[PDB]
Paper text:
Here we focus on the prokaryotic Argonaute AfAgo from Archaeoglobus fulgidus DSM4304. Although phylogenetically classified as a long-B pAgo, AfAgo contains only MID and catalytically inactive PIWI domains, akin to short pAgos. This complex, structurally equivalent to a long PAZ-less pAgo, outperforms standalone AfAgo in guide RNA-mediated target DNA binding.
The crystal structure contains fragments of two partially annealed non-self-complementary DNA oligonucleotide strands forming a short (3 bp) guide/target-like dsDNA region. A similar set of contacts to bases and backbone is also observed in the crystal structure of fAfAgo bound to a short DNA duplex fragment. The AfAgo-N subunit sterically masks the AfAgo surface that was previously implicated in AfAgo homodimerization, making AfAgo oligomerization across this surface unlikely. Taken together, structures presented here demonstrate that fAfAgo heterodimer preserves the g1:t1 base pair recognition mechanism previously demonstrated for the standalone AfAgo, but unlike the isolated AfAgo subunit, fAfAgo binds the guide/target heteroduplex in a specialized cleft in a similar manner as the structurally related long-B pAgos.
Residue numbers in the entry:
A (entry chain A): -2 to 427
B (entry chain C): -6 to 1, 18 to 245
Write the structure that this text describes.
Amino acid sequence: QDPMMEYKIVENGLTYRIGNGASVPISNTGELIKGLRNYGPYEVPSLKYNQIALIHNNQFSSLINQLKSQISSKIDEVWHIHNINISEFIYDSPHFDSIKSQVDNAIDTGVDGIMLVLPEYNTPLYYKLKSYLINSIPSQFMRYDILSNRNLTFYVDNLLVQFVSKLGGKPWILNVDPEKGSDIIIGTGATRIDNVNLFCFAMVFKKDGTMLWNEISPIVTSSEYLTYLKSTIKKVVYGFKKSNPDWDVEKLTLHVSGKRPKMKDGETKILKETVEELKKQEMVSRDVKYAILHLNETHPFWVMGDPNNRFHPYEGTKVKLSSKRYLLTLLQPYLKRNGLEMVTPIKPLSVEIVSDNWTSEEYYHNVHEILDEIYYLSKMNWRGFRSRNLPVTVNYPKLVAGIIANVNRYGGYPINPEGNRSLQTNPWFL
Amino acid sequence: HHHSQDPMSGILYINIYPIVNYPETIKVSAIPYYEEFLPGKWKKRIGDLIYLYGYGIENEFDEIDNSNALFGKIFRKYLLDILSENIATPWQLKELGSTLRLVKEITENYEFSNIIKLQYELIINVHHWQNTNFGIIVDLKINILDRENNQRISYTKIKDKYGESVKKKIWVSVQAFHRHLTPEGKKYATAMRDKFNLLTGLLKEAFGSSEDEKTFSTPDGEIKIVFKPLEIVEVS
DNA sequence: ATCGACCA
DNA sequence: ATCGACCAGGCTACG
Ligand SMILES: [Mg+2]
């Protein structure tokens, strides 16, 4: 069973669930946009004020009117968000104080989200503003200088995917067999931000791709990694459990990723201790079946496939490198209307099973269920319409790390995440 | 020796090149670990023993076979040490440890090649599957170097020092030399196939092999590497 | 920061 | 990011 350096392909047919009980196929942006505009997203966000603030420095600009135009029509026609008005706030000068004034002015009027335009590529200003907004209101940033030479129709309708998600909406979820897969998947690990400092993360997902809870540790040194890794994971399950008391977690999977201290034996030890402690504390089932997997997009392997598929392997290909390590093809060239697209070479994902408490008879059966699940989770991405060559359990922590590292590097506002409920349950990182 | 028969349309290929012949028994000799020990060729620390092998063997030694778990631990490093004595010009050794790294300056013409130096870097590891199956994993990076300095220059500083135009064309050139894009910076239909041909070509040149196979010499016996990417079949 | 990739 | 994206029919764009 499971012969090595052979390959098996995930059984296909996975679909999205977009609302009105409608299912569209994956890997077809045209079908998804058609479905969204006929049946809406899986969940239109319920808003307080039905009001969105647009902040910019261009008074009576034509492109600002075209932008506001595309936003207003597509938010109603594609995403079925009705009766939204867009109030404009002009900041006199492109500096933090001036822009923060208009931001705070927009908060005082009562808005559900802030769409802010900035003139150029200013990394410190962007992250100081982003960290401020993250602690206050859902926000979506834009650059004036780039939307000049873009087709604003593709620019806006792609931009709205993450903004609808930031407002609490649910663009689409995965259609998954309820009898297979994990009850929850915990993406956890850590990411170095300096040569010396790092932070731990843990993010709880349903098998349908939705994020239920997420926590980050404070910025610490590598000597404190294992301690905060255990504390971070326990706090995300606490938050998951209090918001889902009715959920007996009987199968659990841990997706460990991130460039982190090289303590694999110690990390596995502590992670197994954490699950046992959660068992004692009745956060998961007393007889929970679980597995710990290491997911890495960085590795030296490349896989070449069919000449009719741009010499690429097909989606869901599972190559067995060795007894407990696999290469998973998450993404492939996709049919567009007039033929197959041209791609730069696509690298597979390395998956290593590190620990489990399964019996020998169910081992290989369970391994391929969570390998299939890793591929399925690679089809959940609310950052836009194009697919990401990462499972959501690794993609979203990487987005969190990009904000944390840059805010720490350029001097933005601290996230203060544990206190805010919105930050724990909303994809503020998109 | 050990012969690997059929090691591994619907056929896939991986950047692992099989060592179909290798000595089934090797000479190994162990000594207690000492804290002044520093890693190097022909020795490998395993726990609190330091195993000597290959040219590090002198008088007193044990002989272990591919059935022993210790064989794979040592042969994975002893392989790279052997390959490191077989580098052909213009390739040079850059680094040797648990990974073997070779470099050559790219001499094909590319605009801005009087200020910016480019170098293929083959990154070589050893894969150990089944119980008796070994192969070399080869990846390819391209290093960007300021020719004045012979020192690494990032994409940011090139734009700073030499202008944004220069950086753009250098990036496109690296992608072209990687066979990820056309020399014109455009995605094309055979990129993955041409990338695999480039790996196989640079690898055969780095170890002075003109042909599909090549045999190398070890004190225990002769190794034989087949310079064709490993095949992956769909399970029955 | 539209996003999508990608040495250590 | 060096670049361009997505529907059926057919105003070959837009949807
Ligand atoms: Mg974003």
